Amino acid sequence: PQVTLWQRPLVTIKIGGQLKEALLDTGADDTVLEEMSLPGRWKPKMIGGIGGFIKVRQYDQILIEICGHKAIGTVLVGPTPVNIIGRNLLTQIGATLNF
Amino acid sequence: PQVTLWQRPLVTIKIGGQLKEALLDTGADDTVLEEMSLPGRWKPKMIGGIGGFIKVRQYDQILIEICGHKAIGTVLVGPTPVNIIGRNLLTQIGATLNF
Ligand SMILES: N#CN=C1N(Cc2ccc(CO)cc2)[C@H](Cc2ccccc2)[C@H](O)[C@@H](O)[C@@H](Cc2ccccc2)N1Cc1ccc(CO)cc1
């Protein structure tokens, strides 16, 4: 799907048996999800934001289905106001920016 | 051009007779630049974020040259660890996300 940017690019994702809506964010290095329940297995970390620093938990090897595609990797889970799919997963989904 | 996402989608921008580098960011509604010498007047504003809040100066009808493309719009100036090109401009240079 070619996604024009007049509207926020939102996609449906499935994680840990749950359905969410997430943002395709080319500016994000990692993926960060709003507080959710996960089986695991997790490490802490604080990240960079605008503005401020947020402590997040690091879950690696998480299966994510994004718009239909299966992808595995590390997702941070923190106090985000929105679900963000950063480059770590975008690359697996074979996503691209065109202009 | 076509950009893959293995690395940060950084582009060269000319703004106010100054050359900078910015991050194409599909997840940013607006464009937010680090602090710089911008002529003209601006209105105060506050953008939301992750674990914080940055008060920025809103400037409008500002000429921005992204890659070779020229665009005019609202640019937010403020304290950001990165220069971000948001959808308000992305839309103007015709960028599409594809996956
Ligand atoms: N804040 C923040 N946080 C943000 N912003 C700014 C941002 C936010 C909002 C606007 C306009 O309202 C403009 C810019 C938006 C996130 C977002 C989007 C909408 C609403 C809330 C949060 C962007 O979509 C998102 O790509 C980045 C932008 C950014 C990148 C690098 C350094 C600093 C910032 N980010 C922090 C971030 C970094 C790293 C990871 C993973 O490694 C996830 C998230």
Side-chain angles (χ1 to χ4, degrees):
Chain A
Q2 163 212 317
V3 20
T4 72
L5 274 358
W6 296 98
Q7 58 257 276
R8 303 183 95 165
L10 294 180
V11 91
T12 47
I13 68 174
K14 196 209 175 147
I15 351 120
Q18 305 159 76
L19 304 166
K20 320 283 182 75
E21 287 248 71
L23 236 181
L24 319 168
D25 197 339
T26 59
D29 313 82
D30 299 309
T31 295
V32 19
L33 278 35
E34 206 162 23
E35 283 277 356
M36 76 175 300
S37 185
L38 282 190
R41 194 258 189 274
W42 68 261
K43 302 133 150 182
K45 208 65 159 185
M46 314 124 239
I47 66 146
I50 283 200
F53 250 64
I54 89 135
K55 292 169 230 211
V56 116
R57 302 176 321 199
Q58 233 263 358
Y59 286 92
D60 330 86
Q61 334 188 229
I62 298 303
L63 204 237
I64 213 149
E65 329 229 16
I66 297 140
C67 205
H69 330 114
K70 302 175 261 130
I72 292 239
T74 157
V75 343
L76 288 22
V77 166
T80 186
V82 59
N83 298 308
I84 290 129
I85 305 285
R87 310 196 324 281
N88 71 311
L89 297 167
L90 290 165
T91 57
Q92 270 189 83
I93 242 69
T96 241
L97 188 39
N98 261 119
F99 75 108
Chain B
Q2 181 209 99
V3 217
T4 12
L5 296 160
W6 298 94
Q7 221 109 91
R8 297 193 120 181
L10 275 119
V11 277
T12 300
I13 71 147
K14 194 179 176 172
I15 166 71
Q18 308 176 64
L19 310 187
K20 294 181 168 309
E21 278 207 273
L23 217 244
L24 271 16
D25 187 353
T26 56
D29 316 284
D30 300 305
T31 295
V32 193
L33 306 176
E34 5 187 75
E35 47 251 290
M36 77 188 58
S37 5
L38 259 213
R41 256 115 319 114
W42 53 277
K43 316 173 76 39
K45 238 86 177 188
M46 194 173 295
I47 64 191
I50 219 121
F53 73 85
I54 36 143
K55 209 207 50 24
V56 288
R57 312 83 164 116
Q58 190 173 159
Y59 281 76
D60 71 78
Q61 259 250 306
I62 284 165
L63 210 232
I64 319 103
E65 186 157 4
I66 293 139
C67 246
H69 343 287
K70 318 165 139 312
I72 260 229
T74 313
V75 155
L76 278 147
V77 189
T80 167
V82 232
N83 280 324
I84 286 166
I85 311 301
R87 305 181 284 110
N88 67 320
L89 265 0
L90 254 9
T91 267
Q92 255 193 95
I93 67 188
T96 57
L97 224 192
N98 352 284
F99 75 87

